Protein: 6-PHOSPHOFRUCTO-2-KINASE/FRUCTOSE-2,6-BISPHOSPHATASE 3
Organism: Homo sapiens
Amino acid sequence: PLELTQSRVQKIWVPVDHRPSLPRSNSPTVIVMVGLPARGKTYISKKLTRYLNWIGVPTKVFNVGEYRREAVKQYSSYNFFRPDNEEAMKVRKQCALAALRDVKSYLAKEGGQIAVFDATNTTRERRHMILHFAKENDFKAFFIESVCDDPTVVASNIMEVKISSPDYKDCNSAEAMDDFMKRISCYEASYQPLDPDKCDRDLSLIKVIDVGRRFLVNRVQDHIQSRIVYYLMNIHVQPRTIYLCRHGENEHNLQGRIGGDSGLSSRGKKFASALSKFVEEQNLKDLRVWTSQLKSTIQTAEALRLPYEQWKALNEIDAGVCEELTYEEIRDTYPEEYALREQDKYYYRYPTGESYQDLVQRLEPVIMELERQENVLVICHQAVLRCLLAYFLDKSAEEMPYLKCPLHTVLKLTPVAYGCRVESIYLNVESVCTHRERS
Amino acid sequence: PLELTQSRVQKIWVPVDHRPSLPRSNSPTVIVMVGLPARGKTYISKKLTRYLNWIGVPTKVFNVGEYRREAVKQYSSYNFFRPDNEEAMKVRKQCALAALRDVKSYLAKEGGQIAVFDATNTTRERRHMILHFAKENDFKAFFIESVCDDPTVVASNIMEVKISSPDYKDCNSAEAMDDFMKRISCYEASYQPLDPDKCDRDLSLIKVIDVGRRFLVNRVQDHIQSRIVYYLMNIHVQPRTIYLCRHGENEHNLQGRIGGDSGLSSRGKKFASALSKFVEEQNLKDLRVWTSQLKSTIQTAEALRLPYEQWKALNEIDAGVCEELTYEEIRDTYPEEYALREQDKYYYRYPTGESYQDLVQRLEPVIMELERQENVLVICHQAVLRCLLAYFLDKSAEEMPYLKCPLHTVLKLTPVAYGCRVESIYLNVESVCTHRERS
Ligand SMILES: COc1ccc(-n2cc(-c3ccccc3)c3c(=O)[nH]cnc32)cc1
Ligand SMILES: COc1ccc(-n2cc(-c3ccccc3)c3c(=O)[nH]cnc32)cc1
Ligand SMILES: O=P(O)(O)OC[C@H]1O[C@](O)(CO)[C@@H](O)[C@@H]1O
Ligand SMILES: O=P(O)(O)OC[C@H]1O[C@](O)(CO)[C@@H](O)[C@@H]1O
């Protein structure tokens, strides 16, 4: 016995399945957002979902407000949110129940692992109902409460993403701000914060206090909750810029060879000088510079005359047996391998090498550190850059291997609202094109 | 410009240092343990130090009680700890100040990065003094308080590691327990828990409540504090067993070839059957089985008839250009490389390959998951096993590449007191010997 076969795309050893003539073919989690409006619940929901999906955990946000915008006509005022508004209170409950119905369908019938229930969930009654829903559907419940009553932070959220909401199209900036403040007040009487000391002692929760200055963590049940908690503790909303680029053109680039540890070409050295001038012109307070352990990124960083840190995790995707070969030589020596990759570029593993899937797992610590840091310049490689960019730009596993990241071009990332503003800066130095479109 | 050279041992690209005829040649942290006696402060101190050293952060514990045992004669009773004991109170303060003096010498003059100050530090006055010491020496201060008043947990700590203390050699189990309870009571009046709400609002701290059921986290300043917090949140004291072994003997083992993805030899298949019988005889509640993505570990797990999980992080050390070669062929084709490895086995990086140092970084997520889990069987490879074992057995980077991990032998790890009890179980199946002693 013990007969195994290696799967063609992913290169995984599986038992040879000599299936007879008639062949036969862990618990999901509901993340409950808790808190008054303008407490960054949607910011947390979106960011956490972006991270979880990128690491390979299927996650989806269910925002009760969007179910409400669908059911109700155009928004008039805070009067809709009044506790004495009998009709709207019924509508709002129906919307929450409709979102939960879609949560059940996502987790039990669509292969989803995490459902982020993005609502106020400010009352114990609403949360008791969510817990009942979770228990009878065999879903785990994990609560994330954001507590911040700083008026500057509240006003900043209203100004950055609330006033621009479809609800406030007919309102001006000042009356949307005034309406939203009244809207928050509608929730303040009934608001029962999480109490892990007495009432919510058995609940799995995190209390994010004053934009992540302090945390109350109670009863973390599993791996995924522990990961979420770690992530929430590393992220921040301080202003910053992320610059991402590849090493300057190398000798392998000129020969159309993949992988290797070749040095900068004459043009690559020219880009490196151009990059130093660019960096200088950005006039950044304290820039952290990260490179791979491969020569071409280190030579590029050397031109900056700035301290830099080499990460083995930033090294280009390992092509295994195909290292230092041209794509023509890959097609002619390994035709089966070439066609398999073309068909499934994300999951395809090179023989004795890696997949984009392996890269994501390697780059997880890079992402966690990028979150912690304020200004960073990452000098890396084509496949590495695509992964990092897919995380920041919320791109799927399927689109990730095809993202355009040309040589001698800086990608300037500015975190704004619920994403990244991406600015491209070509440093006017010629190079070959290493981008290959799908077939 | 941009001229680099690759360092012989570690394979790091560095600027060619054309040093002239006259060549010229981040803040440490004091971790402050806080809490009454028998609160697992020494358990936390030792475990955290073991983890931090293993990941490459030089860490040392400074236990004030050991400075006291050195200054004072043999221990008589709790009377030494009385608040009205003027003389012993002076001695105890002197001991704390002597430990801090050694903290300063470790962090500022010995290249240490983290000093774990293991004492009660129960008063605000003592903590104010530690903060003053940290501020004037330019050290960061991070507080770890353990709060647990459960009498079962307190009694268990006294029974497991207190009664066996050199202090209680002349006392019997019952009178050591009675003396220790009186000793704790000496500290209870003056005890001022950390107050991150009002008084300790500006301090960087973690409050570990009821053996890690709940956590209060305030003002995490840097990377290392964030890592510590994550680690404390993943560890537990629930009873469990860790079984570690290599895959059954493979075809490359028979040929004396390194690396590769060869399958089990006839003896390797025999071990796999023997392992299944062994596993069955252990009568474990719920065993998690982990393998690498290499065929030989998967074939071994296949014999168990148990579900298993494949980790790419458990794949054997990458030998780069030396993969699938015998050691004789390495010495004859790459003599410089062979001698360099022999001289510096931990830091040595194989060309286009890895070092034991790279393995530790890869295995960090494995260690974190091993901590979270209760019963686990890890079927892996020689170098991978040495790293994991060095973490559990608190072995240095220098000794790690030489740890004996023979084939067809299970290493049964039982966490007891402040370490691991290691039991070896040879499953009576012959194999070749792949262990190579130093030169
Ligand atoms: C761009 O629009 C934003 C709107 C809101 C936020 N935000 C993010 C947090 C926040 C919460 C926990 C961790 C990190 C940030 C937060 C808050 O605690 N209170 C109000 N607002 C908040 C950020 C951008
Ligand atoms: C083997 O001797 C031990 C002595 C003490 C412990 N211990 C560990 C913790 C503990 C604390 C935080 C996280 C994990 C464990 C703890 C405690 O909160 N209160 C009393 N004791 C304790 C374990 C073994
Ligand atoms: O992105 P692709 O086409 O999958 O391949 C990535 C390749 O691109 C390069 O960065 C250069 O073309 C190589 O280092 C790497 O092998
Ligand atoms: O432990 P060493 O002697 O440094 O080398 C590790 C080698 O041992 C093996 O496990 C077998 O000898 C190989 O897979 C690996 O290359």
